[PDB]
Design a protein around this nucleic acid. Structure first.
Lengths: 29, 147, 157, 238, 66
RNA sequence: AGUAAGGUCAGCUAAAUAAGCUAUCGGGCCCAUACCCCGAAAAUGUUGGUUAUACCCUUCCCGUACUACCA
């Protein structure tokens, strides 16, 4: 059984198709 | 023959398979490896402390160098942008005029590569130059993989 | 929890490239080129390394992926000259050839013209630029030769 | 068809032959880097040879304890003299040639440290207008191919050019004057393609009135103000 | 620009001193390279083994009859 | 149907620096052959894993071995 989220989930704006071309953090700060 | 010729070839294949599946060693780069002759302390030149004026001159020069290279990057970055804007605008105009020619324009060039270009020389070649007579001998060390 | 609306909030591996362990050469499409090797040949070691660093940084600013940066083995060639009024060759100087290769991929066909124009305009003096498509032979040329494998192969021939 | 006339232009460019002279700021930086390199470098064999030779002279003059007579025939400082003499005898090529002195804007031997762009003079409506080489597109031929055909149509040239890519580097659209402006031929759409001049040059039949080679800075003298602006976009002066 | 990445230095912890020399090529062109010894100029001789056999003899004839 | 165990020079054994013997090749001895003498060459069943390997484990295969009982 599942329930849809009440709002926008985290990391939903991340485009997984171009994950290779997406800029990474590369640093802790 | 059946127990000698056939068995010999089977064992040769086994040795080939072991060597083919074995890891391959990279050729070492002499540039990165420090020769042991440099480790000798006899080659260590004495160190002379720079004067206060000398250090101040270098520090100001480096500060001016940062701005100079930043302006060089700006000119290069704008040069790339200027070319990109013109090329993209040209492609849009070409597509409107003739879609068929636009399709061929955006295709890759098989004859583009290999692309070879030599750097400019310090001086132009002499129109009438006679180089001396000599021979080129290659003494590059050959590295072989064993075991 | 599964039934709660906050299910899956902690998922993170879908944001990470799958790293689940030589390298297959990816040929380009009709609009993009494949893996390219940018050879940099010069008689000065500093010039070859410095320009390879410049090319590597240029690709990052241009959002061009760099597959690998590596150095080819140094070639050392003796330079001999004929003595005056003599037939004997005498050594004059020793010249070392240093090659730096920067491997890029995913270059656009339209953007290739701009990329090649920029790098050739910045080529230092005494440095030779050669851009070639990556092939298996070039990669295999970085490894030590195996005479033992050759000797066994000669028997099979 | 279309009212506009398809034209394929070739932007043939001569790469610089010699390196650009260093700026006064770069000269200071170049000396510092050379100075820093010497400071952090170890003693070379030539330097070690000179130091030992100086010690041998001291070991031969202060005390008569040297047990070797031959030693070395030539000293390190003496060996530098032979190299210096040979360098003076050798004459380097002239970076600034006779073309620069005479302002001969036809030969390729001018401004070896700059970039030259080929320009030709064509007469349209009894009017001489300086434009880049171009040709009209023909059926069964790519737009880039027309530019390649333009090179073959030049006046007795054996030049070899290396085209970069297939997409055009720029475009220039103009309309014919209203005197001859018609619906069938409203105007033309020029497309530019850049190439690198590897080898070759024009013959000595016609030089002054046929073609000129100028840099981007002096490119405005020949091109029209509207035509110059489009050319200055895809032509760099790095 | 040829000076975009030309002003460099040896990026090594331990390295012998290198001197700026001119490498004269077979066509008379010269380039700035570093060499172990402070030789003001270096000339690359034309390889006599790479010429055609007929042209080698013609060059030898020019050498003779001094 | 189960379980044990073995797989190595051409051959057969020993050791895991993979050797010895015979066989094998080359030479000498002898009118000739063989014996003999000198010298050379020649292998880990296979799979993969064992820091890394081998003698180990393990995949697979050939052959071998024992058991398959009481109503």
């Amino acid at each position: 059984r599942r329930t849809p989220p009440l709002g926008p989930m985290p990391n939903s704006d991340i485009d997984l198709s171009n994950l290779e071309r997406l800029e990474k953090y590369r640093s802790f700060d | 023959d059946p127990k000698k010729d056939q068995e010999a070839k089977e064992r040769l294949k086994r040795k080939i398979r072991k060597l083919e599946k074995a890891t391959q060693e990279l050729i070492p780069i002499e540039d990165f490896i420090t020769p042991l002759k440099f480790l000798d302390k006899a080659r260590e030149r004495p160190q002379v402390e720079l004067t206060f004026e000398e250090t101040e001159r270098r520090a100001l020069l480096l500060k001016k160098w940062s701005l100079y290279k930043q302006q060089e990057r700006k000119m290069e970055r704008d040069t790339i942008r200027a070319m990109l804007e013109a090329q993209q605008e040209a492609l849009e105009e070409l597509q409107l005029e003739s879609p068929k020619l636009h399709a061929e324009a955006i295709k890759r060039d098989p004859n583009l590569f290999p692309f070879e270009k030599e750097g400019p020389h310090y001086t132009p070649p002499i129109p009438n130059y006679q180089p001396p007579e000599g021979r080129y001998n290659d003494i590059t060390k050959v590295y072989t993989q064993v075991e | 929890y599964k039934t709660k609306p906050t299910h899956g909030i902690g998922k993170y591996k879908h944001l990470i490239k799958a790293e689940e362990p030589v390298r297959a050469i990816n040929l380009g499409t009709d609009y993009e080129y494949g893996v390219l090797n940018i050879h940099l040949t010069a008689y000065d070691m500093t010039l070859a390394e410095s320009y390879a660093q410049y090319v590597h940084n240029l690709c990052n600013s241009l959002s061009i992926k760099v597959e690998e940066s590596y150095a080819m083995p140094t070639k050392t060639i003796e330079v001999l000259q004929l003595q005056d009024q003599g037939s004997k060759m005498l050594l004059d100087s020793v010249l070392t050839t240093h090659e730096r290769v920067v491997q890029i991929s995913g270059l656009s066909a339209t953007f290739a013209e701009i990329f090649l124009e920029i790098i050739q305009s910045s080529l230092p003096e005494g440095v030779r630029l050669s851009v070639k498509e990556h092939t298996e032979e070039d990669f295999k040329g970085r490894f030590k030769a195996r005479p033992e494998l050759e000797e066994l192969l000669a028997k099979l021939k | 068809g279309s009212p506009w006339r398809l034209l394929g232009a070739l932007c043939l460019q001569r790469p610089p032959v010699v390196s650009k002279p260093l700026t006064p700021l770069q000269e200071e930086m170049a000396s510092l880097l050379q100075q820093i390199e010497i400071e952090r470098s170890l003693y070379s064999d030539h330097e070690l040879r000179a130091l030992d030779e100086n010690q041998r002279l001291a070991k031969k003059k202060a005390d008569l304890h040297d047990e070797e007579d031959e030693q070395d025939i030539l000293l390190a400082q003496d060996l530098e003299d032979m190299w210096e003499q040979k360098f003076l005898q050798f004459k380097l090529g002239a970076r600034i040639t006779e073309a620069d002195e005479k302002n001969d804007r036809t030969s390729l031997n001018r401004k070896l440290d700059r970039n030259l762009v080929l320009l030709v003079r064509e007469k349209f409506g009894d009017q001489d207008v300086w434009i880049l080489p171009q040709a009209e597109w023909q059926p069964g031929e790519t737009l880039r191919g027309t530019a390649e055909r333009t090179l073959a149509t030049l006046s007795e040239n054996n030049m070899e050019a290396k085209f970069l890519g297939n997409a055009p580097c720029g475009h220039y659209t103009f309309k014919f004057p209203q005197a001859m402006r018609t619906e069938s031929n409203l105007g033309a759409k020029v497309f530019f393609f850049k190439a690198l001049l590897l080898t070759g040059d024009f013959s000595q039949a016609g030089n002054k009135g046929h073609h000129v080679w100028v840099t981007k800075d002096e490119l405005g003298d020949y091109l029209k103000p509207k035509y110059l602006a489009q050319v200055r976009r895809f032509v760099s002066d790095l | 620009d040829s000076s975009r990445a030309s002003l460099t230095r040896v990026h090594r912890q331990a390295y012998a001193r290198l001197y700026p020399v001119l490498l004269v090529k077979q066509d008379g062109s010269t380039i700035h390279i570093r060499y172990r010894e402070p030789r003001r100029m270096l000339a690359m001789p034309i390889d006599l083994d790479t010429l055609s056999p007929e042209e080698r003899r013609a060059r030898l004839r020019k050498r003779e009859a001094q």
